[model samples]
Target: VPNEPINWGFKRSVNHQPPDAGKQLNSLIEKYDAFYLGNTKEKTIYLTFDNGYENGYTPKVLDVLKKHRVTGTFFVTGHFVKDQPQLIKRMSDEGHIIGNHSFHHPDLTTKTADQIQDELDSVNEEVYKITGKQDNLYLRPPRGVFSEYVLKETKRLGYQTVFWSVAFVDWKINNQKGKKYAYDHMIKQAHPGAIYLLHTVSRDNAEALDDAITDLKKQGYTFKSIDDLMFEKEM
Candidate 1:
């Protein structure tokens, strides 16, 4: 009864403003040292993707990132890690941070604390085994679901729970809008210290990423990696 799930979402930010994630949610983020958007007063964007599984669009995404000399954080699930070991290795090798999206992508509010940690651990262990690195200290809860208790457990396990300040309905594989659709939604909603929740499963995102990065860059916004943000905050 005490552990009610709060689905993580926010009203879309408009005209380069930080979206309101509510005061209660903000307090919990501060209390748990979780990260959503970073340093909202700065024109820095963090691009993070949720990879529950690969849809063959990742290579195109990676190509754009490499071309721009920009890196991102990929939150991965157990199935993703198991299915795309080589791609996971490529992500790590290319200086992108890998984040835990949990092993089974469960709704952690329904699970015990130990079970939640185990879910995270399963993904972490598999990634480390493949990449020879332990870098998934950042987590994006499956399905944008969480609770205060879940945040507490995540913190206790030494993870920084990541949410998003910007996102769209870009995860659908069938409703494949074109590059401009992705670009407009990505650009129009961008603000200082934005955390974009993109899905690598989208063909639109894959096609639009290069142009999006280029457009955002031209708008005097600089993209920052999760590691850079962590170091800057010194947390």
Candidate 2:
């Protein structure tokens, strides 16, 4: 039997400090191979999007990133890699990181070790198949569910598990809050070393993304790639 999933809770706020969830989770996972936030002293924000399936807004998202000169990580599934080879290739070509979001979007905590490996490896394989490069070094557990067993297995597979410091209920299709709502929550909750987890499927995020980046810039925040935060020699 597989381990039970631990439901991670995140409380969004506009506090000058990072959320307690981020600090608490980072503390719990610091001994392991996982990253929640980057250097707390740096006014650097890491942007990441979870792509379970394309809703025709990814190209728009990519365009905004290009315009802002910011590189982000896209956590995609096997279906995303298989169905959107062009986009995936463009992401790699444009110097964006393609992260592993598992193959079938299964809750990894409910899968056995072999199944977990299969889920991660299949996406990695798919990305390699299309891009001719192994760039799936980061893993975002499906549904934000993870356990100690899951982290251990993911580490053995040589991936750095990534969680988010800022997020809202942006995954639902029919229940999206408006663009202004998206901007307010995103800008207010931002802090140094914050990692924002947005869904590419949300139209609100797509529409408000440009303004969000612009406002963050006004607040003196700079975007950092996950690679820079994870593997860079020093903060």
Candidate 3:
């Protein structure tokens, strides 16, 4: 659904600028924050997925992750668990971290604190029912939009707000540019503490993922989960 008519003027109000991943990572990375990325000899990259429905592509994504013997995070929506309980069960069984992505994918920044809590609580309750525990610890606001209200609500709920340190424009539905564009743009702009924000809801990602993973590895990069950042002591 189109959220009303698209206002061309909103682009001007919004900071429609590309983030310099390297510079941002170098400057603001904290070592003692509740969850701050730390240095690993490994080129240390984190992969995260924002999921709603399975879309049949998740099984493919799971295959690739499993083949690589990697652990990635999947932020689940409430409806996603209700509709795709099997996939959620599989994700847990596979050692991947499951987090809350809100129940219906609402924009938390635009909602009241109560609304945000309701969303998180609803999703967490359903996830607990399936997983037998509240294993969700990370949260990514819809469309990467969050407000002070969101932060406060999450903190009160004892959940950490998982913000991406690196991302690209891979969410444009119906008019996706191919994988080469993503590869060139993301690779050329890699950073030390990079948190690659990827959407599993696209075709180009399926096409370009292998090459990107291979190229990054050749460059001495290593993929890790937020769990690494949380548990590491030397960092």
Candidate 4:
């Protein structure tokens, strides 16, 4: 039977520790082979951006990542994938992972199985056409909302869903927190295996990106790709 929606959430980590994703949520990630935190023993950060739409900050976001030589995953929707082919190509060219956030970016529970397949396949197809890369792809549910049915179905479709361990009030363009606001949250709340869920719409994130990487590196944390997280387990 289909189930009620579960909105993803976490308690903040303090003192270089990871947050509790809670047992119920943790079980979902484990069962579906989804990702939240990376290997907790390793000081690796997985940077992922949810691209709902192009708000003009993704270029800057990419530039910072490029300069830092870190490959991040950008989970994009059909709006972003179809509208910004060049940017999408650039992301793929730079060796970044183009993760799927779905085509229409709807709530997974609201869609039928066939519709869900359409949502994912459509975006994956368009991205593959533009970037020429699609293997062992990753996905994220829009707005951190999904049901167990959604998770089992998505996993059946060969996608590993990604959630986050690090996030703040950075998605709102109008309510932009200052650079330090973003940077401090990242620096202080950091832990090994943190999957930072950032939004490309936030200027705060764009401004704080460089220093966050620099300081985190200085503190002995490494930025890694989602593939690294999965492949290590396979070996």
The best-first sequence of candidates by lDDT reads 1, 4, 2, 3
In order, the Cα lDDT scores of the candidates are 0.88, 0.85, 0.67, 0.87
Residue range 15-134, candidate 2, lDDT tens digits:
757766655566757767886777778899999989988877888888899999999899999989899999999898888999999999999888888999999999988888888997
lDDT of 1 by residue, 1-235 (tens): 2578899988999889999888988888888868688878788999999998887889889888899999899999999999999999999999999999999999999999889879999898899899889884998999899888898888899998889899987888779777888889988999999999998777757768888889899999999988888888885
| Model 2 lDDT on a 0 to 1 scale | 0.85
Tens-digit lDDT string for candidate 4 (7-59): 88988988889899888888877877676888888889999888878878888
For residue 71, give model 2's deviation from the true position in Å: 0.6
> On a 0 to 1 TM-score scale, where does candidate 1 land against the true structure?
0.97
lDDT of 1: 0.88
Comparison by lDDT, 1 against 4, better one? 1
> Model 2, 131: alpha-carbon shift in Å?
1.0
**Least well predicted 10-residue stretch by lDDT in candidate 1:** 200-209
| 119: Cα error in model 4, Å | 0.3
Clashes of each: 0, 0, 0, 0
Q: After best superposition, candidate 2 residue 208: deviation in angstroms?
A: 0.8
- Global CA lDDT computed for model 3: 0.67
Report per-prediction Cα RMSD to one decimal: 1.3, 2.0, 6.5, 1.2
lDDT leader: 1
Residue lDDT tens for model 3, 1-235? 1122111111111131223335433332232122323343446777778887654567777777887777888888988999998888888888888988899888776676678788888987887777776664777766656544455666777677676655567676777787797777567656555666677666657546666777777887787887776666445
Q: Which candidate number would show the highest TM-score if scored against the true structure?
A: 1
Report the error of model 1 at residue 205, Å. 1.9
Q: Which stretches of candidate 3 lie over 4 Å from their true place?
A: 1-42, 233-235
